[PDB]
Amino acid sequence: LHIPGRLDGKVALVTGSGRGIGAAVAVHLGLLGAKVVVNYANSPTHAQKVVDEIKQLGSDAIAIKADVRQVPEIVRLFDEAVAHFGQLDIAVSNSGVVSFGHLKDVTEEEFDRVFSLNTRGQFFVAREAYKHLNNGGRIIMTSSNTSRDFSVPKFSLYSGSKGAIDSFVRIFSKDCGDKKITVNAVAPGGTVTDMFHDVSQHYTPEERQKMAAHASPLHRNGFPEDIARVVGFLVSAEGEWINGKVLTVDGGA
Amino acid sequence: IPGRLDGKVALVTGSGRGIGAAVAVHLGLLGAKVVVNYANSPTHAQKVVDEIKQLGSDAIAIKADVRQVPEIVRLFDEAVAHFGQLDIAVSNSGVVSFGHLKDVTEEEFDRVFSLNTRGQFFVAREAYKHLNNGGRIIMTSSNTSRSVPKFSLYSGSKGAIDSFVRIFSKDCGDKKITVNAVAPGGTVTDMFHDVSQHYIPNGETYTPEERQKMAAHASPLHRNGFPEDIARVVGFLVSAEGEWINGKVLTVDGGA
Amino acid sequence: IPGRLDGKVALVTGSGRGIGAAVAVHLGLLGAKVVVNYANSPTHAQKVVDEIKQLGSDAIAIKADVRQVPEIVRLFDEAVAHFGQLDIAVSNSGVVSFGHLKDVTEEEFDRVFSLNTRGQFFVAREAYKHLNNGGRIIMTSSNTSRDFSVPKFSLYSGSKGAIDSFVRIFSKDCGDKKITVNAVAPGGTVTDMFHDVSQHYTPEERQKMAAHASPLHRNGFPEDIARVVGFLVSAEGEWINGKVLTVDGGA
Amino acid sequence: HIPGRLDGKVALVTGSGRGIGAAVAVHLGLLGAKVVVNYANSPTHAQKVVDEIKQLGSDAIAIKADVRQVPEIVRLFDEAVAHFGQLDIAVSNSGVVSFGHLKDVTEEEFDRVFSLNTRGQFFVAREAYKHLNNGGRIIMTSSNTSRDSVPKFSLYSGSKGAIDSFVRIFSKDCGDKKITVNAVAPGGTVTDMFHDVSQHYIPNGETYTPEERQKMAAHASPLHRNGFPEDIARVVGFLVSAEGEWINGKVLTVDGGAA
Ligand SMILES: NC(=O)c1ccc[n+]([C@@H]2O[C@H](COP(=O)([O-])OP(=O)(O)OC[C@H]3O[C@@H](n4cnc5c(N)ncnc54)[C@H](OP(=O)(O)O)[C@@H]3O)[C@@H](O)[C@H]2O)c1
Ligand SMILES: NC(=O)c1ccc[n+]([C@@H]2O[C@H](COP(=O)([O-])OP(=O)(O)OC[C@H]3O[C@@H](n4cnc5c(N)ncnc54)[C@H](OP(=O)(O)O)[C@@H]3O)[C@@H](O)[C@H]2O)c1
Ligand SMILES: NC(=O)c1ccc[n+]([C@@H]2O[C@H](COP(=O)([O-])OP(=O)(O)OC[C@H]3O[C@@H](n4cnc5c(N)ncnc54)[C@H](OP(=O)(O)O)[C@@H]3O)[C@@H](O)[C@H]2O)c1
Ligand SMILES: NC(=O)c1ccc[n+]([C@@H]2O[C@H](COP(=O)([O-])OP(=O)(O)OC[C@H]3O[C@@H](n4cnc5c(N)ncnc54)[C@H](OP(=O)(O)O)[C@@H]3O)[C@@H](O)[C@H]2O)c1
Ligand SMILES: O=C(CBr)c1ccc(Br)cc1O
Ligand SMILES: O=C(CBr)c1ccc(Br)cc1O
Ligand SMILES: O=C(CBr)c1ccc(Br)cc1O
Ligand SMILES: O=C(CBr)c1ccc(Br)cc1O
């Protein structure tokens, strides 16, 4: 009885996996039988619950605090991961922040807060992933359906921050080929997390939420484990021949 | 189990050979009962069926030429008759064409579009009609839609598919059926081989395998695409785990 | 002179009424001689021809069903016969179709594709064969090919997605006579077709709600699509080649 | 008829000292616009462009500003309105090219590219919106490699994909002033930047003359020729005209039909 997309005796790291989409990727890869490094930066207990979750279903994990806005903290994060589990097969760039505002009101402090994590951060996560990763490995980065599909106004700073991700992946896949490493991006849609709720107020968390379901031909919201399942396939052996691509997981939204 | 289709029934057009075949075998290995459609290759159709039984699923092989819209309806009513239900339809059948616009006859257009564009349209259609709720539709395109020369006619036949799927996914939502396309690129079959001989300044001079190996250099993974490479993306897409991929075109080429 | 077409001859399919009449009047305005192609509406076409005569450019009406290839061949033979040259060729003629995928018929698909897709391909081919060196080919798509996905618009959208793939490759084939190929992909240009899809109240009221879609707060008119077409097929538009230009004003 | 002329309009182009920007700025002048020739390090060529524009019956002025420093950007737009009294058109053109494998790419090298190409352009568009007449025009410059694959080109190509995403949303925001925002995505326009990129992506570039590698890239165009600054400037011309209005929020690629 053939079991697909498994990751047994493979190590995976997932920036900002304490809560939200990243935490499901952390678990899924754990379920499909990867050992998992669960990076957080502000949510220490949240991360220890994800380490706990992955252990209960028969694989190992350690949480590692790191601000991935800080390239040396990223060097240490990858340096520490390989120190612990011995190697690293999978690196998922998940960590991100949202911003809202009309072009006229967007400040220098605000451009940077956003770009420092979502774009520079993810790029430098990807850098140390290539240096630290084994041959046949997997980088995965997170964009947004807004990058180019969705056209939310007063969403320019955020969308641009992920538009750069869209352009990194097709080229990274050329560069990363000489360690036989595939690079792909996932562009989630409206995944239900603390972030989705902060961007719906633009009332109740769930009342707002109940509108977005009436917009997917599948009449439900996207949830973190809907994106996780697409990253699990992509970091599997099976899905090696998807390379340099931005997958969009929105449900037809 | 994740990625498995235990209890599910599928149908794959042009699954006697090439990507078609590898799709059918993969769906089987995942737990699906596979309908295997051919139009000219019953021997390989019957081999595909037999390989699907051996690994311990079930299959039949119903002859049907998907240019003929009544042969498509029959293909599907017979699909539902033999296994009882249909969950999954994979529109895969296709022909390549080559030529400069200046030398493209009517006959050559009608040949290419009747199967690649129109045929696939009325597979998607008779899929929606015949499918259980929560089911799955896949159509096959090419990475060359959105630029090798003398490749207009075929290229545009698949650009139409890239357009259809986004809308279909709107239409098809009311039975919660997801519709996506795969845009394969450089996959080792008689179609890839008959192509490599045209878009390589030597072509007939070199050997299919010598050409095949030239193209291996193109991928940053430094290898060739094989039907099992594509089969696996479809399988995920038609798993319940692939649900939240909907209305999209996945190019599977290896960075090419 | 800026993007003027003084000394050129153009041909526009379905230029009797619609964006085409406007592309025809526009290429006229910029000093081109214009073949005006109709199939069903000679009285409209005659209005266009006069309006191009009336701002001091020559023009003719030629009946041709761009679904019948033989008639495409005659139209291009006769156009070169009259003006002795053809520099620009605009594939405009198209039809609209609504329906859930479950309802679409072989007949409906073939009514659409015959003209929207297959017709445009063969206008394009015949353009290549008759066109002077350094000439121009425009094909007509929709912002729905890809950009937007409306329910029950699958057939039409497909018809124009085919076009998007054609122009990229066409631009390479046609470059062996230094001819550039592009599509403009309109997006709600007020016309007789808009009023159909608009319907799916009065026309003018179904437009006032349409206005709110553009961040420029206004709908689209043939001139909006025509100015772009005039640029692409000018000398100065040469370096735009093998492209789709979605003219929607935001939408 | 005299079509897309910009008579009585005022325009600003960043880095209109050399390359594309200059041809952009000479084009707007030729089309009747009064032009503000921004530059950071090339004051003489900037001045030659102002004189070349004054020569064809319009007016121009060179302002110095480094569009890496956001306060120099505000100073640039404040000064430009001060001199000519208004501004209709804003062309974010300034940019740099970088080559390197992800691994070799550094913090310093990364900030160097993003601070001008991405951050710079964003804030040129912020201040343009704040200074521009209603009915005006924002253009940003992108690249045909942002999404249209070239090795050791991630950092450059990245910097520009951010622009593509920016112009689609800028179109909406800028709509409350009936302002069209659009990007041009140039290909390999012959410039000192093209020659620096023809040196790296050619079998043995330094063993070749810039013209040699040029002729080589020409054989790759369906138009058997190299694109030139005037080829992009002609397209910018259309976009910023009354007539180009219904192209809003899109990214146009001017490449001659290939790389
Ligand atoms: N609807 C959506 O959610 C949606 C849609 C499109 C794209 N995305 C993208 O999906 C990704 C994740 O979204 P989400 O919904 O999961 O977000 P979220 O719930 O707000 O969670 C944020 C995650 O980011 C981590 N993080 C933030 N700043 C960090 C830093 N400097 N260093 C390390 N980690 C940091 C957080 O960990 P700590 O709490 O430990 O800081 C947390 O795990 C983001 O890139 C987002 O843009 C999401
Ligand atoms: N290989 C590639 O590189 C590549 C790249 C892009 C896209 N594709 C697409 O992938 C699909 C598979 O092609 P392939 O590579 O597998 O090539 P292939 O080996 O040529 O396969 C052709 C398949 O098409 C079926 N077919 C042909 N005419 C048919 C008809 N009237 N009715 C039903 N089925 C018919 C054939 O069945 P019989 O011959 O048995 O009748 C055969 O199984 C096609 O959609 C193709 O356009 C392939
Ligand atoms: N209008 C829009 O909002 C919109 C949006 C996206 C795309 N488009 C595209 O824009 C183009 C023009 O559409 P429109 O809005 O101007 O449409 P329209 O008002 O319906 O005009 C149709 C034009 O097509 C011609 N035509 C139809 N069938 C023909 C045939 N067999 N042979 C020759 N000519 C034929 C008509 O001429 P006869 O009357 O002589 O038959 C008429 O000139 C079309 O290709 C359409 O698909 C339009
Ligand atoms: N040429 C191509 O092949 C090509 C292809 C695709 C895209 N592009 C893009 O098109 C644009 C034009 O490139 P190009 O070929 O014209 O390049 P170029 O010859 O290098 O010209 C560079 C321009 O950038 C300006 N610049 C540099 N740093 C600046 C700063 N801090 N502030 C203001 N201006 C600054 C320069 O002015 P100073 O003299 O003052 O530095 C000069 O005007 C760039 O955005 C480029 O990325 C070019
Ligand atoms: O991207 C996000 C959250 Br960061 C998003 C939110 C709401 C909707 Br409706 C669509 C979206 O793409
Ligand atoms: O279409 C085919 C073979 Br039918 C194809 C082959 C190789 C590449 Br790279 C792209 C393609 O689209
Ligand atoms: O398709 C049509 C008319 Br055929 C259309 C109408 C309105 C808008 Br907004 C976009 C469109 O594409
Ligand atoms: O942008 C650059 C380097 Br500035 C470029 C050069 C040549 C070609 Br072909 C495409 C490009 O995008």
Side-chain angles (χ1 to χ4, degrees), chain A residues 145-147 151-163:
Chain A
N145 65 154
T146 73
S147 54
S151 292
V152 191
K154 291 164 158 232
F155 211 44
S156 55
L157 171 52
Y158 176 78
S159 290
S161 77
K162 298 319 193 64

mmCIF file of all heavy atoms in Angstrom, chain A residues 145-163, unseen atoms left out:
data_model
loop_
_atom_site.group_PDB
_atom_site.id
_atom_site.type_symbol
_atom_site.label_atom_id
_atom_site.label_comp_id
_atom_site.label_asym_id
_atom_site.label_seq_id
_atom_site.Cartn_x
_atom_site.Cartn_y
_atom_site.Cartn_z
ATOM 1 N N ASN A 145 -1.499 36.248 -2.955
ATOM 2 C CA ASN A 145 -2.286 36.312 -4.211
ATOM 3 C C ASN A 145 -2.397 37.779 -4.610
ATOM 4 O O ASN A 145 -2.717 38.048 -5.767
ATOM 5 C CB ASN A 145 -3.646 35.625 -4.076
ATOM 6 C CG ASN A 145 -4.587 36.279 -3.091
ATOM 7 O OD1 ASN A 145 -5.800 36.147 -3.223
ATOM 8 N ND2 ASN A 145 -4.049 36.965 -2.100
ATOM 9 N N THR A 146 -2.116 38.679 -3.677
ATOM 10 C CA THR A 146 -2.218 40.133 -3.926
ATOM 11 C C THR A 146 -1.022 40.587 -4.758
ATOM 12 O O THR A 146 -1.147 41.584 -5.485
ATOM 13 C CB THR A 146 -2.286 40.866 -2.589
ATOM 14 O OG1 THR A 146 -0.992 40.827 -1.991
ATOM 15 C CG2 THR A 146 -3.300 40.247 -1.656
ATOM 16 N N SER A 147 0.096 39.876 -4.641
ATOM 17 C CA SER A 147 1.317 40.265 -5.375
ATOM 18 C C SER A 147 0.902 40.718 -6.770
ATOM 19 O O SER A 147 1.274 41.830 -7.156
ATOM 20 C CB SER A 147 2.278 39.127 -5.421
ATOM 21 O OG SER A 147 1.657 37.963 -5.941
ATOM 22 N N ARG A 148 0.116 39.905 -7.473
ATOM 23 C CA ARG A 148 -0.235 40.243 -8.874
ATOM 24 C C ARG A 148 -1.684 39.906 -9.213
ATOM 25 O O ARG A 148 -2.316 40.729 -9.896
ATOM 26 C CB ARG A 148 0.661 39.451 -9.827
ATOM 27 N N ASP A 149 -2.191 38.769 -8.725
ATOM 28 C CA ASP A 149 -3.614 38.401 -8.954
ATOM 29 C C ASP A 149 -4.510 39.422 -8.244
ATOM 30 O O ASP A 149 -4.977 40.363 -8.914
ATOM 31 C CB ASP A 149 -3.902 36.970 -8.494
ATOM 32 N N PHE A 150 -4.736 39.238 -6.941
ATOM 33 C CA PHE A 150 -5.570 40.189 -6.159
ATOM 34 C C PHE A 150 -4.998 41.603 -6.310
ATOM 35 O O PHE A 150 -3.762 41.749 -6.347
ATOM 36 C CB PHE A 150 -5.633 39.766 -4.689
ATOM 37 N N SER A 151 -5.874 42.609 -6.390
ATOM 38 C CA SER A 151 -5.421 44.018 -6.541
ATOM 39 C C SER A 151 -6.023 44.880 -5.426
ATOM 40 O O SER A 151 -6.839 45.770 -5.740
ATOM 41 C CB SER A 151 -5.765 44.554 -7.905
ATOM 42 O OG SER A 151 -4.997 43.904 -8.907
ATOM 43 N N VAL A 152 -5.623 44.628 -4.177
ATOM 44 C CA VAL A 152 -6.167 45.394 -3.015
ATOM 45 C C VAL A 152 -5.498 46.770 -2.965
ATOM 46 O O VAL A 152 -4.261 46.813 -2.877
ATOM 47 C CB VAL A 152 -5.944 44.629 -1.697
ATOM 48 C CG1 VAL A 152 -6.709 45.257 -0.544
ATOM 49 C CG2 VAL A 152 -6.281 43.153 -1.835
ATOM 50 N N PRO A 153 -6.250 47.890 -3.019
ATOM 51 C CA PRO A 153 -5.660 49.227 -2.882
ATOM 52 C C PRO A 153 -5.110 49.435 -1.464
ATOM 53 O O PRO A 153 -5.427 48.635 -0.600
ATOM 54 C CB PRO A 153 -6.839 50.181 -3.121
ATOM 55 C CG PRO A 153 -7.883 49.328 -3.813
ATOM 56 C CD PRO A 153 -7.693 47.939 -3.243
ATOM 57 N N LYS A 154 -4.399 50.516 -1.215
ATOM 58 C CA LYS A 154 -3.949 50.659 0.183
ATOM 59 C C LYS A 154 -3.356 49.314 0.616
ATOM 60 O O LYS A 154 -3.396 49.029 1.812
ATOM 61 C CB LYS A 154 -5.117 51.178 1.024
ATOM 62 C CG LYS A 154 -5.543 52.610 0.747
ATOM 63 C CD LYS A 154 -6.910 52.918 1.301
ATOM 64 C CE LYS A 154 -7.146 54.395 1.525
ATOM 65 N NZ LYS A 154 -7.618 54.670 2.901
ATOM 66 N N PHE A 155 -2.848 48.519 -0.336
ATOM 67 C CA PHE A 155 -2.118 47.264 -0.011
ATOM 68 C C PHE A 155 -0.792 47.204 -0.785
ATOM 69 O O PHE A 155 -0.237 46.110 -0.922
ATOM 70 C CB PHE A 155 -3.038 46.084 -0.335
ATOM 71 C CG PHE A 155 -2.876 44.855 0.522
ATOM 72 C CD1 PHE A 155 -2.739 44.953 1.900
ATOM 73 C CD2 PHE A 155 -2.911 43.590 -0.051
ATOM 74 C CE1 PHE A 155 -2.598 43.816 2.678
ATOM 75 C CE2 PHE A 155 -2.773 42.449 0.731
ATOM 76 C CZ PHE A 155 -2.617 42.566 2.095
ATOM 77 N N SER A 156 -0.295 48.348 -1.263
ATOM 78 C CA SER A 156 0.841 48.438 -2.220
ATOM 79 C C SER A 156 2.127 48.007 -1.526
ATOM 80 O O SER A 156 2.856 47.207 -2.108
ATOM 81 C CB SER A 156 0.990 49.818 -2.852
ATOM 82 O OG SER A 156 1.109 50.855 -1.879
ATOM 83 N N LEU A 157 2.387 48.530 -0.330
ATOM 84 C CA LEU A 157 3.637 48.236 0.421
ATOM 85 C C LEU A 157 3.735 46.722 0.625
ATOM 86 O O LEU A 157 4.815 46.180 0.328
ATOM 87 C CB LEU A 157 3.674 48.995 1.756
ATOM 88 C CG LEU A 157 4.816 48.608 2.698
ATOM 89 C CD1 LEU A 157 6.160 48.676 1.989
ATOM 90 C CD2 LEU A 157 4.832 49.476 3.948
ATOM 91 N N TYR A 158 2.650 46.075 1.063
ATOM 92 C CA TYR A 158 2.612 44.614 1.335
ATOM 93 C C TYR A 158 2.830 43.836 0.032
ATOM 94 O O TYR A 158 3.760 43.006 -0.008
ATOM 95 C CB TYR A 158 1.305 44.200 2.016
ATOM 96 C CG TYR A 158 1.188 42.711 2.224
ATOM 97 C CD1 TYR A 158 1.858 42.067 3.255
ATOM 98 C CD2 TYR A 158 0.439 41.926 1.361
ATOM 99 C CE1 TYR A 158 1.780 40.689 3.428
ATOM 100 C CE2 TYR A 158 0.357 40.549 1.517
ATOM 101 C CZ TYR A 158 1.031 39.920 2.550
ATOM 102 O OH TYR A 158 0.931 38.562 2.689
ATOM 103 N N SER A 159 2.016 44.108 -0.994
ATOM 104 C CA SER A 159 2.006 43.394 -2.306
ATOM 105 C C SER A 159 3.378 43.448 -2.994
ATOM 106 O O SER A 159 3.869 42.378 -3.431
ATOM 107 C CB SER A 159 0.942 43.944 -3.226
ATOM 108 O OG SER A 159 -0.352 43.597 -2.753
ATOM 109 N N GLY A 160 3.940 44.650 -3.140
ATOM 110 C CA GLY A 160 5.321 44.853 -3.608
ATOM 111 C C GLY A 160 6.312 44.003 -2.824
ATOM 112 O O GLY A 160 7.208 43.398 -3.454
ATOM 113 N N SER A 161 6.171 43.941 -1.497
ATOM 114 C CA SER A 161 7.101 43.185 -0.616
ATOM 115 C C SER A 161 7.141 41.724 -1.073
ATOM 116 O O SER A 161 8.210 41.108 -0.939
ATOM 117 C CB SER A 161 6.749 43.306 0.849
ATOM 118 O OG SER A 161 5.648 42.485 1.169
ATOM 119 N N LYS A 162 6.029 41.214 -1.618
ATOM 120 C CA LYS A 162 5.874 39.799 -2.058
ATOM 121 C C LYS A 162 6.091 39.680 -3.569
ATOM 122 O O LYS A 162 6.498 38.600 -4.023
ATOM 123 C CB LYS A 162 4.500 39.257 -1.654
ATOM 124 C CG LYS A 162 4.239 39.229 -0.153
ATOM 125 C CD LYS A 162 5.428 38.784 0.692
ATOM 126 C CE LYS A 162 5.050 38.474 2.126
ATOM 127 N NZ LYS A 162 4.125 37.318 2.230
ATOM 128 N N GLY A 163 5.851 40.742 -4.328
ATOM 129 C CA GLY A 163 6.205 40.781 -5.759
ATOM 130 C C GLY A 163 7.664 40.444 -5.984
ATOM 131 O O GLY A 163 7.963 39.800 -6.989
#
